[PDB]
Structure formats: structure tokens, C-alpha cells
Amino acid sequence: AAAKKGSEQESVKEFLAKAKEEFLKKWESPSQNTAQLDHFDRIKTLGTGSFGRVMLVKHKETGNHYAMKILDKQKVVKLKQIEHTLNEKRILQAVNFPFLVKLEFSFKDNSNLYMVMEYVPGGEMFSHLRRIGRFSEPHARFYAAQIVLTFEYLHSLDLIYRDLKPENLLIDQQGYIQVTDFGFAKRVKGRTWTLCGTPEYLAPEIILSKGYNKAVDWWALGVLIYEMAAGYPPFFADQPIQIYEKIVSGKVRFPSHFSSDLKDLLRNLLQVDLTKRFGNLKNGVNDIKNHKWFATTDWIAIYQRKVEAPFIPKFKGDTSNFDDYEEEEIRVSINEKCGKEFTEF
Amino acid sequence: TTTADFIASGRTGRRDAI
Numbered sequence: 177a178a179a180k181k182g183s184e185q186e187s188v189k190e191f192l193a194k195a196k197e198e199f200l201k202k203w204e205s206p207s208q209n210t211a212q213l214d215h216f217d218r219i220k221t222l223g224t225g226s227f228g229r230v231m232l233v234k235h236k237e238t239g240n241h242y243a244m245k246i247l248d249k250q251k252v253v254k255l256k257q258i259e260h261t262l263n264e265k266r267i268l269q270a271v272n273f274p275f276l277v278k279l280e281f282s283f284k285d286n287s288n289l290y291m292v293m294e295y296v297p298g299g300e301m302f303s304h305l306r307r308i309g310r311f312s313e314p315h316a317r318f319y320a321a322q323i324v325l326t327f328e329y330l331h332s333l334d335l336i337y338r339d340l341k342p343e344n345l346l347i348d349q350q351g352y353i354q355v356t357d358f359g360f361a362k363r364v365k366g367r368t369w370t371l372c373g374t375p376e377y378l379a380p381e382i383i384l385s386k387g388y389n390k391a392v393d394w395w396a397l398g399v400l401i402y403e404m405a406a407g408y409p410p411f412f413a414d415q416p417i418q419i420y421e422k423i424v425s426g427k428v429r430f431p432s433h434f435s436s437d438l439k440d441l442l443r444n445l446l447q448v449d450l451t452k453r454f455g456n457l458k459n460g461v462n463d464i465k466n467h468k469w470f471a472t473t474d475w476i477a478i479y480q481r482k483v484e485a486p487f488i489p490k491f492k493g494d495t496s497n498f499d500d501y502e503e504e505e506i507r508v509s510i511n512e513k514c515g516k517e518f519t520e521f
Numbered sequence: 522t523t524t525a526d527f528i529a530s531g532r533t534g535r536r537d538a539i
């Protein structure tokens with residue numbers, strides 16, 4: 177059993193070295209303009225944001241459904257999101273992992289940037305978590321296991337993720353997870369300093385305006401596990417300022433139904449001292465993978481998507497897991513906007 | 522309960538990045 181885990185571990189090292197080779201290849205010469213707007217029939221708007229929208233579209237020739245993320249170049253520039261948006265596309269077209277969203281096509285026109293991903297009708301974990309209330313520990317563990325492997329993958333490429341929350345996680349038709357957003361993802365060796373993320377999920381060292389490293393992702397995993405299993409996040413308040421106070425305080429109250437194993441994991445993930453936080457110690461991610469809360473997890477079977485999911489959203493093209501938005505035209509100027517800012521896209 | 526305080530907290534919808 178130990179030599180099978182050792183062989184497992186060596187398989188993982190070998191896999192990651194290969195994945196990095198292939199990542200760096202796509203990363204150094206990214207794809208561009210792999211489709212055009214007219215190839216798609218727009219169906220419905222699935223989301224809106226400060227500098228763009230997401231729309232359900234259907235490829236006319238293939239009939240496959242896609243989520244099309246449309247970003248207004250001029251607003252990206254005004255809101256100082258150029259680097260994040262360039263980073264999102266470049267990372268997504270370069271990464272390759274079972275629990276990431278699949279970027280199929282990207283292109284730009286005079287006005288907008290387009291990223292075209294395989295459509296996941298199940299929607300975001302957020303809506304399901306809020307409706308069901310909370311997930312049981314086995315259920316939460318299923319999702320958490322996929323985030324652990326995803327972070328082992330991203331971190332091996334020197335990518336800090338920085339955007340973990342139920343809002344950015346989809347539940348696909350097999351009940352498995354797809355991580356959506358990479359605007360805040362950044363290739364870094366060592367520390368970085370940008371104040372970014374979501375208040376409930378921010379590690380203390382982010383709030384304290386000191387540098388931080390990939391340990392913030394393991395902290396965020398702790399927040400995610402806690403929120404999935406309890407039904408509410410470990411640090412909440414009416415205003416972000418009040419949330420930050422609680423985060424830095426170092427005090428977490430656990431629900432009475434949390435198992436001893438879960439609480440012990442969370443104390444080590446929600447460790448205010450980053451130098452003592454699981455995933456940032458000498459044994460790296462293995463301290464998490466070998467923790468008793470994950471004793472029953474078959475990491476190989478999770479990676480290969482062989483475990484039966486505890487929840488499969490009701491299979492109905494369907495739009496019901498997304499809200500309704502006022503449909504507006506996609507505007508394309510007769511003049512090229514912000515051409516210099518987005519040459520690499 | 523804590524969950525009730527959260528359900529009444531006003532930060533129960535999708536959360537924006539800072």
C-alpha cells in the first residue's frame with residue numbers, strides 16, 4: 177500500500193514534468209483568432225459584468241453549445257483590466273487539466289474580445305450550494321479533492337490562482353468541477369503583492385499588505401471547504417472591513433457537526449501563520465493529500481473521473497441554472513479600438 | 522444561529538472581487 181502510494185507519487189511527478197513541457201509550449205506561442213463571430217448563433221445572455229457579458233451560443237456547423245465571454249475592450253482599458261484579461265486567455269489556451277473549463281476558440285474584432293468555452297448547463301456551484309444549504313462532508317470532500325489536484329497542477333507551473341470561490345466553479349454533467357476564471361492567475365516564483373480576490377476568501381497576508389505566495393490558494397481552499405460543509409463562510413460580516421478583522425484575528429468557530437478530522441484539516445489550512453499552513457510546508461501538497469479527512473479519497477480515481485459524483489444537476493442547451501438578463505446587441509465599431517493594448521490576444 | 526445570521530447578512534448573493 178505504501179509502495180503503491182510511492183509509485184503513485186512518482187507517477188504524479190512524471191505527469192507534472194510532462195504537463196509543464198506542454199504548457200510552456202502553448203504558453204510561448206499562444207493560439208489566436210481561431211474562429212469568428214458569425215460562426216455562432218447567439219441564444220441567451222447568461223451573465224453580465226462591469227466590462228462584458230457571457231452568452232450561450234450554438235456553433236452553426238457543429239450544433240455544439242458554448243459559453244461565449246465577450247469583453248468590451250474600451251471598458252477593460254478604463255477599468256485597468258488589460259493584464260488580467262490578456263492573462264486569462266493566454267493561460268486558458270495553454271493549460272490542460274480535467275477540472276478546468278475548456279477554451280475552444282478566441283478572437284477579437286474592432287470592439288470586443290471573445291473567449292469561447294464548452295457550455296456547462298449545470299451552472300455554478302454557488303447557486304446549488306445556496307439552494308441546498310450545505311453539502312455533507314463526503315460531498316464537500318469530492319469537490320475539495322478536485323481543487324487540491326487542480327492547485328497541485330497550477331502551482332507546478334508556477335501559477336498562483338487567487339480567485340477560488342463557489343462563484344468560479346461549475347458542476348458539469350458528470351457532477352465534476354470546472355474552474356472558470358483565470359484573470360487573477362499569475363505566473364510567479366516566490367511572492368507577489370497585488371491586492372486582489374474576494375473578501376471572504378482573502379488570506380491574512382493579502383489583507384496585511386505584505387507579500388504573499390501560493391499559500392493564499394491553500395488558505396482559500398480552507399475557506400471553500402468550510403463554506404461548502406457549513407453553508408456559510410468562516411468569516412462573514414456586513415462590510416468587507418469587518419470581514420478582514422475577523423480573518424486576521426486568527427479565530428474560527430466550527431459547526432458542532434464538523435468531524436474531528438475536518439476541523440483539524442481546516443485549522444491547518446486556515447492557519448494565519450503562512451509558514452505553518454498546510455500546502456506551504458516542506459511536504460507541500462502531500463500534507464493535505466495524506467490528512468485523515470482525505471483517507472478514503474482515491475486521488476487516482478478522482479483525477480480519472482472514475483468516482484460517481486454525489487450530485488448531478490438535473491439534465492434538461494438548458495438555461496435554468498442561470499438568471500435572466502436584458503438582451504442587448506453586441507456592438508462592433510467601424511473603427512479599431514485599443515489595438516495596441518490587445519495585440520497579443 | 523450562525524447560519525441565520527449569515528442568511529440575514531446581506532452578503533448571501535454572488536460576491537464580487539475587490
Ligand SMILES: O=S(=O)(c1cccc2cnccc12)N1CCCN(Cc2ccccc2B(O)O)CC1
Pocket residue numbers: 222223224225226227228229230242243245277293294295296297299300343344346356357359
Ligand atoms: O458564465 S460562467 O458560469 C462560465 C464560465 C466559463 C465557462 C462556462 C461554461 N458554461 C456555462 C457557464 C460558464 N462564469 C464566468 C463568467 C461569468 N461570471 C462573472 C462575469 C460576468 C461577465 C463578465 C465577466 C465576469 B468575470 O468575473 O470575469 C462568473 C461565472
